[PDB]
Nucleic acid binder design. Structure first.
Ligand SMILES: Nc1ncnc2c1ncn2[C@H]1C[C@H](O)[C@@H](COP(=O)(O)OP(=O)(O)OP(=O)(O)O)O1
Ligand SMILES: [Ca+2]
Ligand SMILES: [K+]
Length: 430
DNA sequence: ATTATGACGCT
DNA sequence: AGCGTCAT
């Protein structure tokens, strides 16, 4: 009752760029705008691998991980943009720089947590309090929420998509109690107004469109964001959670899309997030551990306490390349040449990072995969990163991995290497 | 023969 | 530390 937490203390948003690498390429090349198109890396093997897909192309069934030759079977008129190649490898700099454009705009509105190259969480609790004080108790017009969906509405006693959106928004706003400054539903609504403003600023200042979720925590904001894509935002209220979760597959919730989520389903014999409410906290802890159990107990009730971390910059800067099938590295010279290519890209990015962000990496992590190994990484070793110098880093990387070579001939490398990875970590202020 | 990333948990 | 999981 009066002592039961409801997890309604914060307003959190998640902003997710729509088909991000495609938009970056469509901004640059207007011929690609409003077309079925995709972004591909490399071209020689089966036309290249697709890593991003426009919504026009998704209508034809084109997906990530598809080979472009195969995507062309579904969509013969599919347009393609290729990821830049430098030093023999895909180079993602254009997309990282475009990401910074968006993250810097978002940071004007609130503290952000960079979740990925094109996603950021926003803690809007303070901004909402501020806006509410401005508002001086005046109601919120639907005109302030032109791209907002209210999840679960309309409900109760037109056949167009936008019509339904407005119907739900009207029901929501009709019900709002705008004279209570501490009403969680009102706070979420003001949060959604701010996110409309944020999303308009992003589009105005970069050309890029995005979707967003607004709720009381990160998991719900993330879930909300995906409900109405692209170019829309969705408010998931605390009250919407029981119905929403009642048919929500467990794997849809962030962190439950893999083995843990499969185990929840198998061990408990349930399918939907809402079904978790029927277990005690101790029961859940008994199967999934103390941390996961407590997290699941609260999460299935719409409650999560994970903070929006004040972090706008990546914590690591890495460079990696696969060498699949026949291209696996089988000589010493090969391994050393590619470590150098990786180190040269890493040095370039590190030097830029040091100038931009007043920090220096102090640890170099070297990872490799050996042919035959099922795991993405076979071996990981660290050494000191004391100078931003590509020849030094590549020499150091070789040193920490060179005894992995089983070959009695040290000219040759065996078993052949199917992946190389250099990662700079442990930043200190500079 | 997806590939190139990146954060965080466990022991 | 080195490995594993989960995610864009
Ligand atoms: N598995 C991957 N491999 C390489 N790059 C990826 C992968 N997943 C995502 N990316 C890149 C390309 C994406 O444009 C970008 C953002 O990813 P993501 O948000 O999952 O999809 P998206 O932005 O392309 O479409 P959506 O509109 O569905 O969000 O990150
Ligand atoms: Ca996205
Ligand atoms: K994303």
């Amino acid at each position: 009752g009066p002592h039961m937490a409801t997890g309604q203390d914060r307003v959190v948003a998640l902003v997710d760029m729509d088909c991000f690498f495609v938009q970056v390429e469509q901004r640059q090349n207007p011929h690609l705008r409003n077309k079925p198109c995709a972004v591909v890396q490399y071209k020689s093997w089966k036309g290249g691998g697709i890593i991003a897909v426009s919504y026009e192309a998704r209508a034809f069934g084109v997906t990530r991980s598809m080979w472009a030759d195969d995507a062309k079977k579904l969509c013969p008129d599919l347009l393609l943009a290729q990821v830049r190649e430098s030093r023999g490898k895909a180079n993602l700099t254009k997309y990282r720089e475009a990401s910074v454009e968006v993250m810097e705009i978002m940071s004007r509105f609130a503290v952000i947590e960079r979740a990925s190259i094109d996603e950021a969480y926003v803690d809007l609790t303070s901004a909402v309090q501020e806006r509410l004080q401005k508002l001086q108790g005046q109601p919120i017009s639907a005109d302030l929420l032109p791209s907002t969906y209210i999840e679960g509405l309309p409900q109760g006693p037109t056949v167009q998509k936008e019509g339904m959106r407005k119907q739900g928004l009207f029901q929501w706003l009709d019900s709002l109690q705008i004279d209570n400054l501490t009403s969680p539903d009102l706070q979420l609504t003001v949060g959604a107004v701010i996110v409309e403003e944020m999303r308009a600023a992003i589009e105005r200042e970069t050309g890029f469109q995005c979707s967003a979720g607004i709720s009381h925590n990160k998991v719900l904001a993330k879930l909300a964001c995906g409900l109405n894509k692209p170019n829309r935002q969705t408010l998931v209220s605390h009250g919407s959670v029981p119905q929403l979760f009642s048919q929500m597959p467990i794997r849809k919730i962030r962190s439950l899309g893999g083995k843990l989520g499969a185990s929840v389903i198998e061990i408990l014999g349930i399918e939907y997030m809402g079904e978790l409410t029927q277990f005690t906290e101790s029961q859940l802890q008994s199967h999934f551990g103390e941390k996961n159990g407590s997290w699941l107990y609260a999460m299935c009730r719409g409650i999560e306490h994970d903070p929006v971390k004040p972090r706008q910059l990546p914590k690591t800067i890495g460079c990696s390349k696969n060498f699949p099938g026949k291209t696996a590295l089988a000589t010493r010279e090969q391994v050393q040449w590619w470590l150098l290519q990786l180190a040269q890209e890493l040095e370039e990015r590190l030097t830029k990072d040091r100038n931009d962000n007043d920090r220096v990496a102090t640890q170099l992590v070297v990872s490799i995969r050996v042919q035959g190994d099922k795991r993405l990484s076979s071996l990981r070793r660290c050494c000191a990163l004391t100078r931003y110098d590509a020849h030094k880093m590549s020499h150091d990387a070789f040193t920490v991995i060179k005894n992995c070579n089983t070959s009695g001939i040290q000219t040759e490398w065996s078993p052949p290497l199917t992946m190389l990875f250099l990662c700079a970590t442990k930043f200190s202020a500079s």
